[PDB]
Design a protein around this motif. Structure first.
Motif, PDB file in Angstrom:
ATOM      1  N   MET A   1      30.021  -4.406  40.582  1.00  0.00           N
ATOM      2  CA  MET A   1      28.682  -3.830  40.551  1.00  0.00           C
ATOM      3  C   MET A   1      28.522  -2.844  39.401  1.00  0.00           C
ATOM      4  SD  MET A   1      28.356  -2.993  44.609  1.00  0.00           S
ATOM      5  CE  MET A   1      29.923  -3.130  45.463  1.00  0.00           C
ATOM      6  N   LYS A   2      27.278  -2.481  39.111  1.00  0.00           N
ATOM      7  CA  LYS A   2      27.000  -1.449  38.122  1.00  0.00           C
ATOM      8  C   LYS A   2      26.874  -0.095  38.810  1.00  0.00           C
ATOM      9  CE  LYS A   2      24.982  -3.941  34.267  1.00  0.00           C
ATOM     10  NZ  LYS A   2      23.751  -4.315  33.520  1.00  0.00           N
ATOM     11  N   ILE A   3      27.835   0.785  38.548  1.00  0.00           N
ATOM     12  CA  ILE A   3      27.880   2.086  39.200  1.00  0.00           C
ATOM     13  C   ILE A   3      27.735   3.224  38.196  1.00  0.00           C
ATOM     14  CG2 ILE A   3      29.191   3.596  40.735  1.00  0.00           C
ATOM     15  CD1 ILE A   3      30.838   1.031  41.445  1.00  0.00           C
ATOM     16  N   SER A   4      26.903   4.202  38.537  1.00  0.00           N
ATOM     17  CA  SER A   4      26.760   5.402  37.725  1.00  0.00           C
ATOM     18  C   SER A   4      27.218   6.625  38.507  1.00  0.00           C
ATOM     19  CB  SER A   4      25.313   5.578  37.266  1.00  0.00           C
ATOM     20  OG  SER A   4      24.913   4.508  36.429  1.00  0.00           O
ATOM     21  N   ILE A   5      28.171   7.363  37.947  1.00  0.00           N
ATOM     22  CA  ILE A   5      28.654   8.589  38.570  1.00  0.00           C
ATOM     23  C   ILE A   5      28.212   9.795  37.750  1.00  0.00           C
ATOM     24  CG2 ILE A   5      30.692   9.935  39.215  1.00  0.00           C
ATOM     25  CD1 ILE A   5      31.491   6.432  39.090  1.00  0.00           C
ATOM     26  N   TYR A   6      27.724  10.823  38.435  1.00  0.00           N
ATOM     27  CA  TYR A   6      27.199  12.007  37.770  1.00  0.00           C
ATOM     28  C   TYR A   6      28.073  13.222  38.058  1.00  0.00           C
ATOM     29  CZ  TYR A   6      23.169   8.935  37.369  1.00  0.00           C
ATOM     30  OH  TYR A   6      22.342   7.869  37.102  1.00  0.00           O
ATOM     31  N   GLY A   7      28.883  13.595  37.075  1.00  0.00           N
ATOM     32  CA  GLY A   7      29.827  14.681  37.231  1.00  0.00           C
ATOM     33  C   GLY A   7      31.250  14.163  37.283  1.00  0.00           C
ATOM     34  N   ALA A   8      32.033  14.499  36.263  1.00  0.00           N
ATOM     35  CA  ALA A   8      33.427  14.085  36.203  1.00  0.00           C
ATOM     36  C   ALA A   8      34.290  14.988  37.074  1.00  0.00           C
ATOM     37  CB  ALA A   8      33.924  14.101  34.766  1.00  0.00           C
ATOM     38  N   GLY A   9      33.846  16.228  37.239  1.00  0.00           N
ATOM     39  CA  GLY A   9      34.593  17.212  37.999  1.00  0.00           C
ATOM     40  C   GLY A   9      35.440  18.082  37.092  1.00  0.00           C
ATOM     41  N   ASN A  10      35.380  19.392  37.307  1.00  0.00           N
ATOM     42  CA  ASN A  10      36.175  20.326  36.523  1.00  0.00           C
ATOM     43  C   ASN A  10      37.653  20.182  36.865  1.00  0.00           C
ATOM     44  OD1 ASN A  10      37.076  22.387  34.893  1.00  0.00           O
ATOM     45  ND2 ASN A  10      36.299  24.044  36.193  1.00  0.00           N
ATOM     46  N   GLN A  11      38.374  19.444  36.027  1.00  0.00           N
ATOM     47  CA  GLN A  11      39.765  19.105  36.304  1.00  0.00           C
ATOM     48  C   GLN A  11      40.697  20.312  36.263  1.00  0.00           C
ATOM     49  OE1 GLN A  11      40.376  16.093  37.471  1.00  0.00           O
ATOM     50  NE2 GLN A  11      38.183  15.730  37.154  1.00  0.00           N
TER      51      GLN A  11
END
Length: 194
Positions: A1-11
């Protein structure tokens, strides 16, 4: 599927303060970037939107890109990609803001879902005017990890389904799509009433 994630996260938070590799194991990046990697390795077409490059080192970024994840910094470009839009906002500071930004740009029948525990009806009511009058095709739900994404003990995702008192914030197809997304990465889905 085509997925969009918003925010990688402060590693750095995961590594410096939280000591995730020592306490839960696994391997950085965790959170949204970790979800992006796991989704991509499961064969999904993943776009990760992150405005701040400094959230992780170049080595961790390469790790994300090696998984096949396309990284952008513009939420609106990300909005036009995914049929599923994952708002990675564990602190829920900008959850409603991102949703408001992307709602008019997401493709037909797309799903917007948060990873935190802001109730789906709350997320819906913040966009009720648009969702009832202009974007009736858009489904609202959740993709809430019980643990930290990227950690081996992270097994469960909670998905907000049809409310007990009848209200459907997403179609059954849209909910089923989220359920199979969870299972595609070897995780256990769990549908709750919104």
């Amino acid at each position: 599927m085509k997925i969009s994630i918003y925010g990688a996260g402060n590693q750095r938070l995961y590594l410096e303060q939280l000591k995730v590799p020592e306490k839960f194991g696994g391997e950085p990046p965790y959170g949204g970037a970790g979800m992006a990697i796991e989704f991509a390795k499961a064969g999904h077409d993943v776009v990760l939107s992150e405005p701040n490059r400094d959230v992780m080192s170049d080595d961790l970024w390469k790790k994300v890109e090696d998984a096949g994840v396309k990284v952008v910094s513009d939420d609106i470009e990300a909005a036009k990609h995914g049929e599923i839009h994952v708002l990675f906002t564990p602190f829920g500071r900008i959850t409603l803001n991102i949703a408001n930004t992307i709602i008019e740009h997401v493709p037909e029948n797309a799903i917007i879902c948060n990873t935190c525990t802001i109730p789906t009806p709350v997320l819906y009511r913040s966009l009720e005017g648009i969702l009832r009058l202009k974007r009736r095709d858009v489904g609202i739900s959740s993709m809430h990890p019980t643990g930290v994404p990227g950690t081996p003990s992270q097994k469960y995702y909670t998905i907000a389904g049809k409310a007990l008192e009848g209200k459907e914030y997403a179609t059954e197809d849209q909910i089923n799509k989220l359920v199979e997304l969870v299972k595609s990465v070897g995780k256990i889905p769990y549908v709750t009433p919104a």
